[PDB]
UniProtKB/Swiss-Prot annotation, chain A:
Organism annotation: Sus scrofa (Pig)
Any GO molecular function: protein homodimerization activity
Alphabetical keyword list: Lipid metabolism, Mitochondrion, Phosphoprotein, Transferase, Transit peptide
Known catalytic reactions: a 3-oxo acid + succinyl-CoA = a 3-oxoacyl-CoA + succinate; acetoacetate + succinyl-CoA = acetoacetyl-CoA + succinate
Domain of life: Eukaryota
Keyword Lipid biosynthesis recorded: no
Protein name listed in UniProt: Succinyl-CoA:3-ketoacid coenzyme A transferase 1, mitochondrial
Record localization: Mitochondrion
PANTHER family per the UniProt record, alphabetical: KETOACID-COENZYME A TRANSFERASE, SUCCINYL-COA:3-KETOACID COENZYME A TRANSFERASE 1, MITOCHONDRIAL
Record PTM N6-succinyllysine, positions in chain: 146, 371, 374, 408
Known EC number: 2.8.3.5
C-alpha cells in the first residue's frame, strides 16, 4: 500500500477513457475527495461503474456536470436531473444493470472468474437485450443492450454474465491502518468492498488512518493486499439525500386497506425485504410480539425505525435512500454478499409494489418506455429466487379503471413467474403453480363480478374464498 | 435460528445418501460434535464435501472408520490410512477437487450461482478427465472423472465448474450471539464460512453463546439468516496435527530462492524449500506471506505458549501471524490467489516442462492424495511462479524436460526454475533460458542433466546466493 497526502497525486495517472469503479450507494460511502480530485485533473471519457449517479451536485453527478463521464454502468439513476438530461440528450451512455448482477460481476472481476451464470434478469431486457444505452437527439434509441446467453441448470434458466474489471477503483472507507488494512462503517460499505478487488489500481480514501492493531485480524473488511493507494480524506460533507426522522400513516381508503392486509403476510422469525411505501408501511402494523427480520439490499439485516434527530447518520440508509436505524442483533455486509443472500434464496419474503402483474406471476415495476427509464435497482434480484415468497402490494386498477392485473404484462418485465401473491384494496390473489391467479380473498361488499371487471384476465376462485382480512 | 441442546437432535433428520458439507481445514475448524452425532445416528452412504479427510482418528476419518461415507469431494486426503485403504480397495469414491475451485463452487451454491468459469485445472486431469474417483479391486480405475467444458475469455481458457449445494452443512464456529449471529476464530474459518451459506439446512456448533450486542454489527462473519440450527459444542479436543515450535544441494536452492523476494511483495510459499527461504529475508525488507487456508501476514513458528490449534499454515503446521495480518474464508483466499493479487507463488515440483508445465501433485499408481491448492496457485497470469527443486531425480533421471510424464498441476505457468545447478527463466512460447549457473559447473554439465535444450542468457552469471 502506497500512502498519499494529496488526492490529486493518487489519481493523476488515471487515463482518459479509463473504466473506474466508484463505491457508493446513494450518497452513502461515496469517495468525494477522490471525485474532487478527478474534477481537478480533468480526466475524461471515463466509463464509471457505480451503483447510482449520486445527485446533481454531489458524488458522481459532479463528474456528470463537468462532462467527464462518457458511459455509466449502474442499477438506479433517479434523483439526478443532470444525469437525466445527458442520458436523454444522447450525451451519456448508460447500461442499466441489476444491482445484484452488477455486484457479483465486480466480485467475479476480482476473483479471477471471467463469467458466471445467474437467473436475475432472465425473461427481461437484460437477457433479451434492447435496453436503451444511448439515445439520439430525436428520442430514438442509438445504442441498445445485446442479449445474453441462456443456459439451463437443474430445470431452471440462467443467463451468462461477464466480470467487470476496472483500471481504477475509487473507494471510500472509514478507516485504514498504517499497513493498509481497511474497514467500512455501517451501510457505507455496499459496493466499496467488492470494488477494491476488481481494479488494476485501487485508490482508497478514508476518514481516518489508524495504527496497526486497531482491528482484530478477523475483522478486516479489506485486507491490505487489495489497497494499492491510500489517502486520508481532506474533507467530508456526507450529504443526506432524504432526511427521515421520527418524532417520538394509513392515508386514504385504498392505501389503508392494502397496508392492513399486507401486514398479515409477516410471520414470526421471517426474513423479509420490503420495498418503500406500502410494504415498508405495513411493517408498522407487525405485532409487537412478532419478530420479523428486515433486510436492506444495500447491505443491512435488522433494519429499524427512522432515527430521532440525534440518531441521524449519513452512513446508515435503507434501499429507499432514507436515513434509518438498525436494531440490536443487526449486521452489515457488502452489496455482493447482500445479493448472494437474496439470489441464494435466504430471504423468506420479498414484498414490493408493481405497475403490472401477470396471471402466472410475471412482474413489471422498473420501466415505462419513453416515459420512465431510471433503472431496476435491486428489484430483479429480489424476485429471482424460487425459495423466496414474492408478494406485490398495489391498487387493483389504475386511473380510468385501467387494468394492472392481466394475462401478460405490457410493460418491461422485472421478473418472470416470480409473484406468489397479489394484494390490492379489492382482493388478494394467490398464484398457484398449476392454476395461476386465484382469488382467495375479496373485500367485503364486493362481488366476484366486481373483481372480474377490474381485472384484465380471467382467474380461478378459491372454494375457500374469504372476506379480505385486515390486521387487527 | 433454532437453538439445540443436543447435537444429535439437530442432525437426526439427515437422510442416508445426503450431501453433507463438513467445515474444516486439516484439523482446524472441524465440527467434532456434529461429527460425533453422525456416528450415533448411523446415517450412511453420505457424500461428504470436505477439504480434507482429517486423520484416521479425528474429523471425517471417524466417519470413514464407521463406513458412513460412500463418496468424498476433497482437495487433499493425505495422512489418513483409513481413507487410503478404502479408496484403494474400491470401497470409497473420491472426487479430487482443487481447493480454490471447491471453495468457489460452494460459495456459488449459496449465492444462487449454478455455474461459473475458472482457469484453475486447465490442461490437467481436472479439465481433461481421467482423475481416479473409484478403483476396482483389481487395481484398475472403476470411475474416472469426466472432462469439463472449456471456454475462451479474453485470450485465456477457463473451465466450467458447477455449484455445490448440500442438504446439510456441518459447521464449526467460535461464538454466536443470542440472535444467531456467528463469528469465526483465526484460520479456523476456512470452509466453515462459505459452507454455512450453501446448504438447505445448516447446523452450526459453537464454543460460546454471547449476548446480543457483543459483536460490532460490521464484524459479524456469518449473519443469523444463514444459521438454521445452532448448538453449543458439548466437548472440544481440537487436536493438532503437526506441532511446529521454536526456541548443500538443498542449501544452494534455498539461498538462491530467497533472492526472489522483494520489498512489499505478496507471496505464497509451499512447505519445504520455498518456506525455508523466507528465513533468509532481510529485516529491512517487508514480505507479506499468504496462506491459502485464509491468512495474510504469516509469522514464524510459535513459541510453546503461542501454539494455537486454530492457527495453522497450508502445510498443517502450527504458526503465528504478524501485526497487520488478516484472516478470511477459503473462498476469499482463493479469489485473492485466483485474481492474481498474490505476486509470487514459489513451490516444489517433480517435473517442469520446457514451456513451463508443472507436475507436482500425482504419481500414477504410486501416489494419489489430491492437488490441494497447487492448481489455483499457478492459475493466474498476473502471478510470478517460481519452482524450487533438485536438478535431477534418483538415477539422474531428468526433472526438467520436453514434456512432463507425471500428471500436470498447471500448463505453461512456471516463470522461473531454481535448482542447485542453475536458474532458468521460463517463457511459454520460446522455452528455457539459462540465466544463472552454479560456479564450478559448465553449460555442458547442465545439458546432460536436463531433458531438453535451452538458450543461454548472454548475461549468464554465476548463481547468486543470499548472504
Amino acid at each position: 500500500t502506497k500512502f498519499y497526502t494529496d488526492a490529486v497525486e493518487a489519481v493523476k495517472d488515471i487515463p482518459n477513457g479509463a473504466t473506474v469503479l466508484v463505491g457508493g450507494f446513494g450518497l452513502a460511502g461515496i469517495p468525494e475527495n477522490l471525485i474532487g480530485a478527478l474534477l481537478k485533473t480533468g480526466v475524461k471519457e471515463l466509463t464509471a461503474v457505480s451503483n447510482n449517479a449520486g445527485v446533481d451536485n454531489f458524488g458522481l453527478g459532479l463528474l456528470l456536470q463537468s462532462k467527464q463521464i462518457k458511459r455509466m454502468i449502474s442499477s438506479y439513476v433517479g434523483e439526478n436531473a443532470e444525469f437525466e438530461r445527458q442520458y436523454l440528450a444522447g450525451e451519456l451512455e448508460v447500461e442499466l444493470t441489476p444491482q445484484g448482477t452488477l455486484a457479483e460481476r465486480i466480485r467475479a472481476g476480482g476473483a479471477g472468474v471471467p463469467a458466471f451464470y445467474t437467473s436475475t434478469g432472465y425473461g427481461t431486457l437484460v437477457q433479451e437485450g434492447g435496453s436503451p444505452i444511448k439515445y439520439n437527439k430525436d428520442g430514438s434509441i442509438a445504442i441498445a443492450s445485446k442479449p445474453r446467453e441462456v443456459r439451463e441448470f437443474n430445470g431452471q434458466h440462467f443467463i451468462l454474465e461477464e466480470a467487470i474489471r476496472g483500471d481504477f477503483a475509487l473507494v471510500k472507507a472509514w478507516k485504514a491502518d498504517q499497513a493498509g488494512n481497511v474497514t467500512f462503517r455501517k451501510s457505507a460499505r455496499n459496493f466499496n468492498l467488492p470494488m477494491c478487488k476488481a481494479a488494476e489500481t485501487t485508490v482508497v480514501e478514508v476518514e481516518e488512518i489508524v495504527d496497526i492493531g486497531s482491528f482484530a485480524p478477523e475483522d478486516i473488511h479489506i485486507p491490505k493486499i487489495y489497497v494499492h493507494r491510500l489517502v486520508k480524506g481532506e474533507k467530508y460533507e456526507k450529504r443526506i439525500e432524504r432526511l427521515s426522522v421520527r418524532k417520538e400513516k394509513l392515508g386514504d381508503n385504498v392505501r389503508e386497506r392494502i397496508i392492513k392486509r399486507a401486514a398479515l403476510e409477516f410471520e414470526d422469525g421471517m426474513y423479509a425485504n420490503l420495498g418503500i411505501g406500502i410494504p415498508l408501511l405495513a411493517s408498522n402494523f407487525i405485532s409487537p410480539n412478532m419478530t420479523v427480520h428486515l433486510q436492506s439490499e444495500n447491505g443491512i439485516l435488522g433494519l429499524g425505525p427512522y432515527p430521532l434527530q440525534n440518531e441521524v447518520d449519513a452512513d446508515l440508509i435503507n434501499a429507499g435512500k432514507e436515513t434509518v436505524t438498525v436494531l440490536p442483533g443487526a449486521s452489515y455486509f457488502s452489496s455482493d454478499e447482500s445479493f448472494a443472500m437474496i439470489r441464494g434464496g435466504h430471504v423468506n419474503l420479498t414484498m414490493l409494489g408493481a405497475m403490472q402483474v401477470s396471471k402466472y406471476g410475471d412482474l413489471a415495476n422498473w420501466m415505462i418506455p419513453g416515459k420512465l427509464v431510471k433503472g431496476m435497482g435491486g428489484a430483479m434480484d429480489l424476485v429471482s429466487s424460487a425459495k423466496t415468497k414474492v408478494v406485490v402490494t398495489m391498487e387493483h386498477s389504475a386511473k380510468g379503471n385501467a387494468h394492472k392485473i392481466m394475462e401478460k404484462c405490457t410493460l418491461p418485465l422485472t421478473g418472470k413467474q416470480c409473484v406468489n401473491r397479489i394484494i390490492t384494496e379489492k382482493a388478494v390473489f394467490d398464484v398457484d403453480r398449476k392454476k395461476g391467479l386465484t382469488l382467495i380473498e375479496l373485500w367485503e361488499g364486493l362481488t366476484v363480478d366486481d373483481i372480474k371487471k377490474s381485472t384484465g384476465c380471467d382467474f380461478a376462485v378459491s372454494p375457500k374464498l374469504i372476506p379480505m382480512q385486515q390486521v387487527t
